[PDB]
Design a binder for these strands. Structure first.
Length: 162
RNA sequence: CACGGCAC
């Protein structure tokens, strides 16, 4: 019963749609996926993005992630946001060696198995008090969701072993 | 900001 959450970085402008008027959208998500979801109310001063923490079973976590991806994609269409919205996962640096693997073998396997392109933020962009690397996943809603499942499997495995 | 909230 691993208790490491999934942490996402989403554009600030899509949070209103994720939560929904009176909280109705996120309330439905957390009910349906049996998840605890915490949306940061203050932007990271890094960029125009807010972090979302999702605590659930691996399956409930993946379902909540996909729901958020679906909501974001629909809002972008609705406001004619033309740019791509990659999935961004934050992961503590202590887990990223295993996600990448020797010679990048593990990350390349996830890219092939899910048809995505995954890039991880550079090690020297960390700060002493922000140890979280940004995992950027470019793909469709469907492939990004599959990538999240595989990515978090390796993160949890690192979490329980490294 | 569509702004919700499951404690120890």
């Amino acid at each position: 019963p691993c208790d490491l959450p999934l942490r996402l970085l989403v554009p600030t402008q899509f949070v209103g749609a994720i939560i929904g008027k009176e909280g109705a959208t996120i309330r439905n998500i957390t009910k349906q996926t049996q998840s605890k979801i915490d949306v940061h109310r203050k932007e990271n001063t890094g960029a125009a993005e807010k972090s979302i923490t999702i605590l659930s079973t691996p399956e409930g976590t993946s379902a909540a992630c996909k729901s958020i991806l679906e909501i974001m994609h629909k809002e972008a269409q609705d406001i004619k946001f033309t740019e791509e919205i990659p999935l961004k996962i934050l992961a503590h640096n202590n887990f990223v060696g295993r996600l990448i693997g020797k010679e990048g073998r593990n990350l390349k396997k996830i890219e092939q198995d899910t048809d995505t392109k995954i890039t991880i933020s550079p090690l020297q962009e960390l700060t002493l008090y922000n140890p979280e690397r940004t995992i950027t996943v470019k793909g469709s809603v469907e492939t990004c969701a599959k990538a999240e499942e595989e990515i978090m499997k390796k993160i949890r495995e690192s979490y329980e072993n490294d």
